[PDB]
Amino acid sequence: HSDLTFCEIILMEMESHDAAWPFLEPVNPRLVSGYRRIIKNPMDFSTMRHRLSRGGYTSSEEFAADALLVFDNCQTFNEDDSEVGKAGHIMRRFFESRWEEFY
Numbered sequence: 001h002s003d004l005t006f007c008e009i010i011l012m013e014m015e016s017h018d019a020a021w022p023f024l025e026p027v028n029p030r031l032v033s034g035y036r037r038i039i040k041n042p043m044d045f046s047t048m049r050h051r052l053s054r055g056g057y058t059s060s061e062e063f064a065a066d067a068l069l070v071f072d073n074c075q076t077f078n079e080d081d082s083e084v085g086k087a088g089h090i091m092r093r094f095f096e097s098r099w100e101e102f103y
C-alpha cells in the first residue's frame with residue numbers, strides 16, 4: 001500500500017518531533033482530573049503505532065482520523081496557552097502541512 005507507506009513515514013516524524021512529548025503515550029485519567037468525563041475517545045501516537053503494527057488500518061483516511069483526534073482532544077481539554085496546548089498546535093500544524101504535501 002502506498003497510503004500505508006506514507007502513514008508510517010508521517011507517524012515516524014511525529015513520534016520524533018520535539019513537541020510530541022504530550023502525545024507519546026495515553027493520558028492516565030487517574031492522574032488528570034476531569035479527563036475521563038471530557039474526552040470521550042482518547043487517542044495518542046503509541047495507540048496509532050500499535051494499530052499500524054498489527055495491520056489495523058484499512059485506508060490512510062482512518063489513520064488521518066486518529067491523528068486529528070489527538071489534536072481535537074488536545075484542544076478540547078487544554079487551554080491554547082497551556083504547555084500541552086502549545087505543543088499540540090505545533091504538532092497539529094506539522095501534521096496538516098505534511099499530510100497535504102503528499103495528498
Ligand SMILES: CC(=O)c1c(C)[nH]c(C(=O)N2CCC[C@@H](c3n[nH]cc3CN3CCCC3)C2)c1C
Pocket residue numbers: 021022023024025026027028032035073074077078084
Ligand atoms: C491532559 C492532557 O491533555 C495531556 C496530554 C494529551 N498529554 C499530557 C502530558 O503532559 N503527558 C502525556 C503522558 C505522559 C506524560 C509524561 N511522560 N513522561 C513524563 C511525563 C509527565 N509529564 C507531566 C509533567 C511533566 C510530563 C506527559 C497531558 C497532561
Ligand SMILES: [Mg+2]
Pocket residue numbers: 068
Ligand atoms: Mg477537523
